[PDB]
Amino acid sequence: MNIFEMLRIDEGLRLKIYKDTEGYYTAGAGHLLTKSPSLNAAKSELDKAIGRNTNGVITKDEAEKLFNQDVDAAVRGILRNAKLKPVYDSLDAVRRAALINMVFQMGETGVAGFTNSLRMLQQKRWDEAAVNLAKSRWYNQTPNRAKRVITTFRTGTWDAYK
Ligand SMILES: [Cl-]
Ligand SMILES: [Cl-]
């Protein structure tokens, strides 16, 4: 298992514009297009991201390319973030993937906000961090996925994904 396979299970991969769990226009593997309610604006962003008039439809290769870029950007976002970097550096490989997943889903800013959990993860207090992470809108809105990421941070294994 790895970050790509992990996120592939969490986000899926749709070749048409769709609405995410929050009702926003997205495409591919969780690639957010816009928070605006306009399909047009969505199609515009998609074409600009792909580099062609897509008409709301992309191929698998195109989806995968967006996916790769998005994973690379999450990592780089983590490394550039003063609050995130230190945590990431302190973790083992499986847990780093869990942190990438959260960032991919909620953005660098969102995650940097779990101040207390981050401190706990950095201290390797696994069970504590898991309980703290669960007291959040994130867990209440997308519980199954949150459970999967949380168990990952708790156990340091891919069990929740196998
Ligand atoms: Cl883009
Ligand atoms: Cl869920």
CSV table of C-alpha atoms and ligand atoms in Angstrom, one decimal:
chain,number,residue,atom,x,y,z
A,1,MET,CA,0.0,0.0,0.0
A,2,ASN,CA,1.1,3.6,-0.6
A,3,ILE,CA,-0.2,7.2,-0.6
A,4,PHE,CA,-1.6,6.9,-4.1
A,5,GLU,CA,-3.4,3.7,-3.4
A,6,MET,CA,-4.6,5.0,-0.1
A,7,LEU,CA,-6.0,8.2,-1.5
A,8,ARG,CA,-7.5,6.3,-4.4
A,9,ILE,CA,-9.6,4.4,-2.0
A,10,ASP,CA,-10.6,7.5,-0.1
A,11,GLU,CA,-11.5,9.8,-3.0
A,12,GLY,CA,-12.3,7.4,-5.9
A,13,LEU,CA,-11.7,8.5,-9.5
A,14,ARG,CA,-14.5,10.0,-11.6
A,15,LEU,CA,-14.0,11.1,-15.1
A,16,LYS,CA,-16.8,13.6,-15.1
A,17,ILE,CA,-17.5,16.7,-13.0
A,18,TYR,CA,-19.2,15.7,-9.7
A,19,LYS,CA,-20.1,17.2,-6.4
A,20,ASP,CA,-18.0,16.4,-3.3
A,21,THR,CA,-19.3,15.6,0.2
A,22,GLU,CA,-19.7,19.4,0.8
A,23,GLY,CA,-21.6,19.9,-2.5
A,24,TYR,CA,-18.6,21.4,-4.4
A,25,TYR,CA,-17.7,20.9,-8.0
A,26,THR,CA,-14.8,18.5,-8.3
A,27,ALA,CA,-13.4,16.1,-10.8
A,28,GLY,CA,-11.0,13.1,-11.0
A,29,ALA,CA,-9.6,12.0,-7.6
A,30,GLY,CA,-10.9,14.7,-5.4
A,31,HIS,CA,-9.6,17.6,-7.5
A,32,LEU,CA,-11.7,20.6,-6.2
A,33,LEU,CA,-12.7,22.8,-9.0
A,34,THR,CA,-14.5,25.6,-7.3
A,35,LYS,CA,-16.7,26.4,-4.4
A,36,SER,CA,-19.0,28.5,-6.5
A,37,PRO,CA,-22.3,27.1,-7.3
A,38,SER,CA,-21.9,27.6,-11.0
A,39,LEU,CA,-21.3,24.6,-13.4
A,40,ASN,CA,-20.0,27.0,-15.8
A,41,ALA,CA,-17.4,28.3,-13.6
A,42,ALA,CA,-16.6,24.6,-12.9
A,43,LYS,CA,-16.1,23.7,-16.5
A,44,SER,CA,-14.0,26.8,-17.0
A,45,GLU,CA,-11.7,25.7,-14.1
A,46,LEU,CA,-11.5,22.2,-15.4
A,47,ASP,CA,-10.5,23.3,-18.9
A,48,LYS,CA,-7.9,25.6,-17.5
A,49,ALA,CA,-6.5,22.7,-15.4
A,50,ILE,CA,-6.4,20.2,-18.3
A,51,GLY,CA,-5.5,22.6,-21.0
A,52,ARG,CA,-8.4,21.9,-23.4
A,53,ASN,CA,-12.1,22.3,-23.9
A,54,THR,CA,-13.2,19.3,-21.9
A,55,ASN,CA,-16.9,19.8,-21.7
A,56,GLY,CA,-16.9,18.4,-18.2
A,57,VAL,CA,-15.3,15.1,-19.2
A,58,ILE,CA,-11.7,13.9,-18.9
A,59,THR,CA,-9.8,10.8,-19.7
A,60,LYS,CA,-8.2,8.5,-17.1
A,61,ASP,CA,-4.7,9.7,-18.0
A,62,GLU,CA,-5.8,13.3,-17.5
A,63,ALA,CA,-7.4,12.4,-14.1
A,64,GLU,CA,-4.2,10.7,-13.1
A,65,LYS,CA,-2.1,13.6,-14.0
A,66,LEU,CA,-4.2,15.9,-11.9
A,67,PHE,CA,-3.9,13.4,-9.1
A,68,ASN,CA,-0.2,13.3,-9.3
A,69,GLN,CA,0.1,17.0,-9.2
A,70,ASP,CA,-2.2,17.2,-6.2
A,71,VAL,CA,-0.2,14.7,-4.3
A,72,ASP,CA,3.0,16.5,-5.0
A,73,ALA,CA,1.4,19.7,-4.0
A,74,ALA,CA,0.2,18.4,-0.6
A,75,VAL,CA,3.6,17.1,0.2
A,76,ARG,CA,5.2,20.4,-0.7
A,77,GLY,CA,2.7,22.2,1.2
A,78,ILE,CA,3.5,20.2,4.3
A,79,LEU,CA,7.2,20.9,3.9
A,80,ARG,CA,6.7,24.6,3.5
A,81,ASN,CA,4.4,24.9,6.5
A,82,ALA,CA,6.1,25.8,9.8
A,83,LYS,CA,3.6,24.0,11.9
A,84,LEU,CA,3.4,20.9,9.6
A,85,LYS,CA,6.9,20.3,8.7
A,86,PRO,CA,8.2,19.4,12.1
A,87,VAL,CA,5.4,16.9,12.7
A,88,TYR,CA,5.9,15.2,9.3
A,89,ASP,CA,9.6,14.9,9.9
A,90,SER,CA,9.0,13.3,13.2
A,91,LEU,CA,6.8,10.5,11.8
A,92,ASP,CA,7.4,7.1,10.3
A,93,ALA,CA,6.4,6.4,6.7
A,94,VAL,CA,2.9,5.0,7.2
A,95,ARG,CA,1.9,7.9,9.5
A,96,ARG,CA,3.4,10.4,7.1
A,97,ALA,CA,0.9,9.1,4.5
A,98,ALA,CA,-1.9,9.7,7.0
A,99,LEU,CA,-0.9,13.3,7.3
A,100,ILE,CA,-0.6,13.7,3.6
A,101,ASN,CA,-4.2,12.4,3.3
A,102,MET,CA,-5.6,14.9,5.7
A,103,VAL,CA,-3.8,17.7,3.9
A,104,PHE,CA,-5.1,16.5,0.5
A,105,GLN,CA,-8.6,16.6,1.9
A,106,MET,CA,-8.7,19.8,3.9
A,107,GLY,CA,-5.8,21.9,2.8
A,108,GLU,CA,-2.6,22.9,4.7
A,109,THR,CA,-4.4,25.6,6.6
A,110,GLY,CA,-7.2,23.3,7.8
A,111,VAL,CA,-4.7,20.8,9.2
A,112,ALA,CA,-2.3,23.3,10.7
A,113,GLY,CA,-5.3,24.1,12.8
A,114,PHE,CA,-5.4,20.8,14.7
A,115,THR,CA,-2.9,22.2,17.1
A,116,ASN,CA,-3.4,19.9,19.9
A,117,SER,CA,-3.5,16.7,17.8
A,118,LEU,CA,-0.3,17.8,16.0
A,119,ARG,CA,1.5,18.3,19.3
A,120,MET,CA,0.3,14.8,20.4
A,121,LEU,CA,1.4,13.2,17.2
A,122,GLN,CA,4.7,14.8,17.5
A,123,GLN,CA,5.1,13.4,21.0
A,124,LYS,CA,4.1,9.9,19.8
A,125,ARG,CA,1.1,9.8,22.1
A,126,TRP,CA,-1.0,7.7,19.7
A,127,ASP,CA,-4.1,6.9,21.5
A,128,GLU,CA,-4.3,10.4,22.8
A,129,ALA,CA,-4.0,12.0,19.4
A,130,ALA,CA,-6.7,9.6,18.0
A,131,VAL,CA,-9.2,10.7,20.6
A,132,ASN,CA,-8.4,14.4,20.0
A,133,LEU,CA,-8.6,14.0,16.2
A,134,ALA,CA,-12.1,12.5,16.5
A,135,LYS,CA,-13.5,15.6,18.3
A,136,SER,CA,-13.9,17.6,15.0
A,137,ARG,CA,-16.2,18.5,12.3
A,138,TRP,CA,-14.0,16.5,10.0
A,139,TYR,CA,-14.8,13.3,11.9
A,140,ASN,CA,-18.5,14.1,12.3
A,141,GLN,CA,-18.9,14.9,8.5
A,142,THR,CA,-16.9,12.1,7.0
A,143,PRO,CA,-16.7,9.5,9.7
A,144,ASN,CA,-15.6,6.5,7.7
A,145,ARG,CA,-12.7,8.1,6.1
A,146,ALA,CA,-11.8,9.9,9.3
A,147,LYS,CA,-11.8,6.5,11.1
A,148,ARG,CA,-9.5,5.1,8.5
A,149,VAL,CA,-6.9,7.9,8.8
A,150,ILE,CA,-7.2,8.0,12.6
A,151,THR,CA,-6.5,4.3,12.9
A,152,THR,CA,-3.6,4.7,10.6
A,153,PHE,CA,-2.1,7.3,13.0
A,154,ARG,CA,-3.0,5.2,15.9
A,155,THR,CA,-1.4,1.9,14.7
A,156,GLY,CA,1.2,2.9,12.3
A,157,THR,CA,0.0,0.2,9.9
A,158,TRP,CA,-2.3,0.0,6.8
A,159,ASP,CA,-4.8,-2.3,8.4
A,160,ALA,CA,-7.8,0.0,7.9
A,161,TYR,CA,-7.1,0.0,4.3
A,162,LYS,CA,-6.6,-3.7,3.9
B,1,CL,CL,-4.6,22.7,-11.3
B,2,CL,CL,-16.9,9.1,5.2
